[PDB]
Design a protein around this ligand. Structure first.
Ligand SMILES: Nc1nc2c(ncn2[C@@H]2O[C@H](COP(=O)(O)OP(=O)(O)OP(=O)(O)O)[C@@H](O)[C@H]2O)c(=O)[nH]1
Ligand SMILES: Nc1nc2c(ncn2[C@@H]2O[C@H](COP(=O)(O)OP(=O)(O)O)[C@@H](O)[C@H]2O)c(=O)[nH]1
Ligand SMILES: [Ca+2]
Ligand SMILES: [Ca+2]
Ligand SMILES: [Mg+2]
Ligand SMILES: [Mg+2]
Lengths: 440, 50, 421
């Protein structure tokens, strides 16, 4: 009861899913074969970890997850890798030909050939749920599958599950690790087509994660493996309230009430601390006040933008580990007297707090220090619109010359879809200005 | 004078139960509006995609 | 006039409800298995007001436990007195109400409400002479607020000649779960104004301030807040539960306390405040002190329409009468002169882990401060239609929010009218 189904789409979605599920197995004491010795109820139950794991009669704990890619090579590494026994083969879905960094191929030409099979496999997971809460969708903005197949899937899920919650984890493109010149086209097309179908979207700027890996973990040239381990810690903080019990534990749905004042304004800024090497953590214990203070440093944000130059509509603190409310409340009081935290005039200023007592876990061979306490701040700030403004500008430079547009038109798209998507983004940028203006 | 009193009590009671009846009518209209908007969303997403 | 049916709805309602039954079971000498092991005939004389008698001289609370999620009722069933409740009186769905009044009142709650009324009817049918109903709930969430006020409307439809009493926990930004609490509270107050006879306003603002300022608790928990609520609830139900002359049933309390039908929102108070020996002068001064009030309203900012004072313990009835007369005579301007003798006093010999205590129930025009505070928080969001999509998604229109706001502003004006008269 209260099951959540995860859907991992395309390379970024799949490799981030690998890192998240590895970490969840370590957090819950689940072995790579699916066995969980601490679980005394064989073949079922309604423990908090059953939101994300189903159970077979043979004691196997199976992710409530589908992995989809339009080419096989990334999902083939899950099929032959360390966690190969965790997943039933029917949860891992591949085509033969990818979307070639083209939204139009992911949504239409290649995507149409596999969408009915993917919905079939998702239906099989939904049918084993006694009270399905909703879906968590992991994808890139920049890839053809991450952009175009995800848009198609989100539209089809609105039809087949009506208003069931759909949450996204969306990888926003950075030039240091980008693979396509057309990523801005793909980003705007998928944001436009998905925006009415998504309840809440957590954007992860590859450039913010890349910089955190370089600056805080002293990684000279971060790989996807480095970025994904850090992303999995942030995802785990957000989903921890669904996967664990505790008196001070606050369900993600209750944070969502505070984070989404209007349906379109559904893009929270995540900030995570502490991100520290084993060599720096040694004999340096970071207190509740230190990790809380670090949530108001822009350098710890998942998206590059400056909240000191916008307005808050919501601030949520999701603590894990050795944290009591007394220390949180003193940390917040100190921060209020010292920082640039300006709320809109129509929103209350209180910070909403959750505490999960289970400390953070790290993956063996990882870059992050094992710490006693961590925090993820989810804020609704007008500053997140900066990320849209950057992408919209790159879109405008190329689109004014119709650069690369023939690749989309060749797959059956019209120019009208480009100008409609871009107009929706202009109206979104404008919505973020309007909600920040003072009431008359 | 006792029957007249009783009839005023029965009148005030029938007035209350009429007002509570309009409330049940309104409750029935809120949930039907919720269903009709969910169905119209699904319908219009289905048609736009086709 | 005899049986009361108790309903507890949602997380808050069930947490304060469970503490109420623990506290009054201990006062009446009832143990967690429902067996009587007390030392006084005073404990059993009016036991039937709150308890049914079962096979083998077992006492079973006349209590119905309601929620749209199972979690808080599983915790009640595991709590100390959890086994005393009738198992068929647990009525719960699986969906929850997401802190949304519209889900409680119109969508999720509507699905569950008929099965709650089946249990109310079963309890009501075996009553020799039902006095009426008391509901414990919060106004800030979805189940207690939205489904609680739906239940009240349906109970009134089926029992229109019976008294409806609520213990209603008013939300505060100081002890807040969501930004939408002021919406849920305004929609609920609109229901309570029309469909209750008596509402005890339990303000989380006041309970927090008492725990912080007076009891020196640096970090108040819901447990600390609920200790104040359960002591107040024991105090204000003493006259219903023990032999006595004054306010001995729900209709007589209403007739003494409610001069105009809409002005039925009471400011409770308690002395002494607790987490060794108090004199009658000290009880009396403390029970009337702003700092001992469970609603964050300054009684010096309004006038008392009516007051009930209940003294508990072995004390001089002469000294209680003298002190109660002293407060009225010395502070005469704060008691409206157009309701003569508007302060009534009861004394019960059985004290609550104290030798003596005083409970205060006031109908003060200062209660408008509580409604104005909720009204200001409502408007700040409603002028930008902020967070409304949570409510329009369940079929509600903006107009329903405009009507609730107007009716609550009208209630404020009416308190102001009698304050100036
Ligand atoms: N953080 C992170 N970003 C990734 C990862 N893999 C790819 N990306 C980013 O995702 C974007 C490219 O999309 P991909 O997910 O590779 O493409 P796809 O969804 O497989 O789409 P096609 O290959 O075109 O069918 C770029 O912005 C990459 O930097 C990954 O494992 N982690
Ligand atoms: N005093 C008190 N207030 C509570 C308690 N639990 C929740 N609240 C308050 O009740 C409101 C939330 O409603 P709640 O009862 O949790 O939601 P429901 O289950 O949907 O009715 C907020 O105003 C909280 O501050 C409690 O045990 N005691
Ligand atoms: Ca199990
Ligand atoms: Ca249902
Ligand atoms: Mg690919
Ligand atoms: Mg709650």
């Amino acid at each position: 009861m209260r099951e959540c189904i995860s859907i991992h789409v395309g390379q970024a979605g799949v490799q981030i899913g690998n890192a998240c599920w590895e970490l969840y197995c370590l957090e819950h004491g689940i072995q790579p074969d699916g066995q969980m010795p601490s679980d005394k109820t064989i073949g079922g139950g309604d423990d908090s970890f059953n939101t994300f794991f189903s159970e077979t009669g043979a004691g196997k704990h199976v992710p409530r997850a589908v992995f989809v890619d339009l080419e096989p090579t990334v999902i083939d590494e899950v099929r032959t890798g360390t966690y190969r026994q965790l997943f039933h083969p029917e949860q891992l879905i591949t085509g033969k030909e990818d979307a070639a960094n083209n939204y139009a191929r992911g949504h239409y030409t290649i995507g149409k050939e596999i969408i009915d099979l993917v919905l079939d496999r998702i239906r099989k997971l939904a049918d084993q749920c006694t009270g399905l809460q909703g879906f968590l969708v992991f994808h890139s903005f920049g890839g053809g599958t991450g952009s175009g197949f995800t848009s198609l899937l989100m539209e089809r899920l609105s039809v087949d599950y009506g208003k069931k919650s759909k949450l996204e984890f969306s990888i926003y493109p950075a030039p240091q690790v980008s693979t396509a010149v057309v990523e801005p086209y793909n980003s705007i097309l998928t944001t436009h087509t998905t925006l009415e179908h998504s309840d809440c979207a957590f954007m992860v700027d590859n450039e913010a994660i890349y910089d955190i890996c370089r600056r805080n973990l002293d990684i000279e040239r971060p790989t996807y493996t480095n970025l994904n381990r850090l992303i999995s810690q942030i995802v785990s903080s957000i989903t921890a309230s669904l996967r664990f019990d505790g008196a001070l534990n606050v369900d993600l749905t209750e944070f969502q009430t505070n984070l989404v004042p209007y349906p379109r304004i559904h893009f929270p800024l995540a900030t995570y601390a502490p991100v520290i090497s084993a060599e720096k953590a040694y004999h340096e214990q970071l207190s509740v006040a230190e990790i809380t203070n670090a949530c108001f440093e822009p350098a710890n944000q998942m998206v590059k933008c400056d909240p000191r130059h916008g307005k808050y509509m919501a601030c949520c603190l999701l603590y894990r580990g050795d944290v009591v409310p007394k220390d949180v409340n003193a940390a917040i009081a100190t921060i209020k007297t010292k920082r640039s935290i300006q709320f809109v005039d129509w929103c209350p200023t209180g910070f909403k707090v959750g505490i999960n007592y289970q400390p953070p876990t790290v993956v063996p061979g990882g870059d992050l220090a094992k710490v006693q306490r961590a925090v993820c701040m989810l804020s609704n700030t007008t500053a997140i619109a900066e990320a849209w403004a950057r992408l919209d500008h790159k879109f405008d430079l190329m689109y004014a010359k119709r650069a690369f547009v023939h690749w989309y038109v060749g797959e059956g798209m019209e120019e009208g879809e480009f100008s409609e998507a871009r107009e929706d983004m202009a109206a979104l940028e404008k919505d973020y200005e309007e909600v920040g203006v003072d009431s008359v | 004078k006792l029957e007249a009193a009783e009839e005023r009590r029965k009148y005030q009671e029938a007035e209350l139960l009429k007002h509570l009846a309009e409330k049940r009518e309104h409750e029935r209209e809120v949930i039907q509006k919720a269903i009709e908007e969910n169905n119209n969303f699904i319908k219009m997403a289905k048609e736009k995609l086709a | 006039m005899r049986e009361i049916v108790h309903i507890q709805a949602g997380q808050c309602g069930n947490q304060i409800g469970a503490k109420f039954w623990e506290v009054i079971s201990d006062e009446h000498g009832i143990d967690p298995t429902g067996s009587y092991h007390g030392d006084s005939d005073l404990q059993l004389e009016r036991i039937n007001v709150y308890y049914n008698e079962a096979a083998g001289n077992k006492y079973v609370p006349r209590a119905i436990l309601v929620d749209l999620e199972p979690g808080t009722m599983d915790s009640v069933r595991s709590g100390p007195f959890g086994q005393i409740f009738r198992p068929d009186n647990f009525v719960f769905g699986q969906s929850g109400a997401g802190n949304n009044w519209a889900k409680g009142h119109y969508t999720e709650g509507a699905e569950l409400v008929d099965s709650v009324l089946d249990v109310v009817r079963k309890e009501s049918e075996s009553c020799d002479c039902l006095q009426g109903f008391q509901l414990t709930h919060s106004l800030g969430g979805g189940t207690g607020s939205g489904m609680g006020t739906l239940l009240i409307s349906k109970i009134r439809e089926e029992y229109p000649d019976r008294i409806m009493n609520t213990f209603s926990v008013v939300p505060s930004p100081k002890v807040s779960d969501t930004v939408v609490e002021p919406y849920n509270a305004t929609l609920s107050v609109h229901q309570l104004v029309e469909n209750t006879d008596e509402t005890y306003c339990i303000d989380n603002e006041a309970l927090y301030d008492i725990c912080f300022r007076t009891l020196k608790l640096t970090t108040p928990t819901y447990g600390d807040l609920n200790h104040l609520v359960s002591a107040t609830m024991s105090g204000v139900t003493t006259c219903l539960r023990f032999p006595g002359q004054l306010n001995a049933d729900l209709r007589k309390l209403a007739v003494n306390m409610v001069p105009f039908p809409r002005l039925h929102f009471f400011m409770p108070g308690f002395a002494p405040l607790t987490s060794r020996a108090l004199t009658v002068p000290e009880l009396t001064q403390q029970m009337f002190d702003a700092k001992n009030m469970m609603a964050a309203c300054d009684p010096r900012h309004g006038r008392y329409l009516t007051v009930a004072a209940v003294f508990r313990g072995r004390m001089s009835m002469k000294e209680v009468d003298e002190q109660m007369l002293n407060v009225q005579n010395k502070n005469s301007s704060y008691f409206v002169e157009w309701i003569p003798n508007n302060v009534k006093t009861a004394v019960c010999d059985i004290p609550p882990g104290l030798k003596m205590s005083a409970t205060f129930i006031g109908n003060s025009t200062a209660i408008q401060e509580l409604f104005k505070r909720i009204s200001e928080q409502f408007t700040a969001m409603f002028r930008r239609k902020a967070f409304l999509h949570w409510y329009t998604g369940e079929g509600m229109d903006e107009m329903e929010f405009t009507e609730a706001e107007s009716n609550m502003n009208d209630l404020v004006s009416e308190y102001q009218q009698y304050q100036d008269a």
